[model samples]
Target: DKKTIYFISTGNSARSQMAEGWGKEILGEGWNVYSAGIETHGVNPKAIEAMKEVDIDISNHTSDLIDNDILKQSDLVVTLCSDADNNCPILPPNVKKEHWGFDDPAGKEWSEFQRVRDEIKLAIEKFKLR
Candidate 1:
């Protein structure tokens, strides 16, 4: 059976979006990839530019508030930052939770986006995706 990988961040704005982009790009349809925010901040411009440099287009991705409906159903839930990790709702006993910390790159320039994107990319890669 295919597994679902859900990435969560405070706003689903930057790091979580980067991770989802890489996860879906590298893993293809073998895994169901999703992401949400404890609260929505929409997609960050820097994040879009960072992915632009890497050729991963997530410009159209929407920022969604935590979907408990989806959370209970996910095989794994990954928190992209400290705030998200602490605020995410309780998951079912069978659902797995992991901490993948990457500080917000919100106030930084597009130049700084690359490194933050790299952090999330590396974390997703460690899942042995693809």
Candidate 2:
């Protein structure tokens, strides 16, 4: 059965936040999704726009760092980049963990914005099926 998941990245501005939004939308009542980073930062506007294009409203999402309470409650921890996968502190013993290695779409040039956005959407879809 699907379980509550915590998504992690170096920054919670883009990819990890996007994944959490997608998971919550697609998984519906089957999963609980949350996202965080190693440190808090503002959510990227481009990410908000990109997710909006897909009809997922992430405007209220806030960037935050991983916390003991989140780790205690999460059933799985999915890291969205190498840095998060490597640097995140150890989680509670019951939480499973995995890495998705998604690109940081915020760094893309304007011309590639849509391409990266679509890629993030695709990744979300793929993970939903698994």
Candidate 3:
């Protein structure tokens, strides 16, 4: 089977990270998950907290940029952020590209963080169902 990679957010912190986690958890070994940003700015702490609530450990994951090598190896590429989608790089002719726009959960106020987190979770679940 082919691996699906996703790129999201400026920081490569929240949405993309969460999607990678949920994709790995729900899809298991059948899928290869990866996430990146236009520039690496590290992962988000609130994202960590949200995933930990479900016992998904993403503490070891690091932010990275999608390079030619990753695009070459991936069977599919998904853009999760508006910026990434607008400035997406070229892909191999055989590789498929998709856009899954999502809000940057990191932008939410501290008081609304969990609500935003849950919203992200719900969105991931819906995407998984599709």
- For model 2, how does the per-residue alpha-carbon lDDT over 61-86 read when each residue is reduced to its tens digit? 99998888888888888888898899
Give the root-mean-square deviation of each candidate in angstroms: 1.5, 2.0, 2.2
Off by over 4 Å in 1: none
TM-score (all chains, Cα) for each model? 0.93, 0.87, 0.83
Better of 1 and 2 by TM-score: 1
Which segments of model 2 are wrong by more than 4 Å?
none
Best by lDDT: 1
TM-score comparison, 2 vs 3, better candidate: 2
Model 2 is weakest, by summed lDDT over 10 consecutive residues, at 110-119
How much lDDT does each candidate structure score? Answer: 0.85, 0.81, 0.75
Rank the candidate models, highest lDDT first: 1, 2, 3
Preferred candidate (lDDT higher): 1 or 2: 1
Over the stretch 22-123, how does candidate 1's per-residue lDDT look in tens digits? 989876667899999989988987788889888999888999998888888898899988888999987999999999777677887665687888877777
Worst 10 residues of 3 by lDDT: 110-119
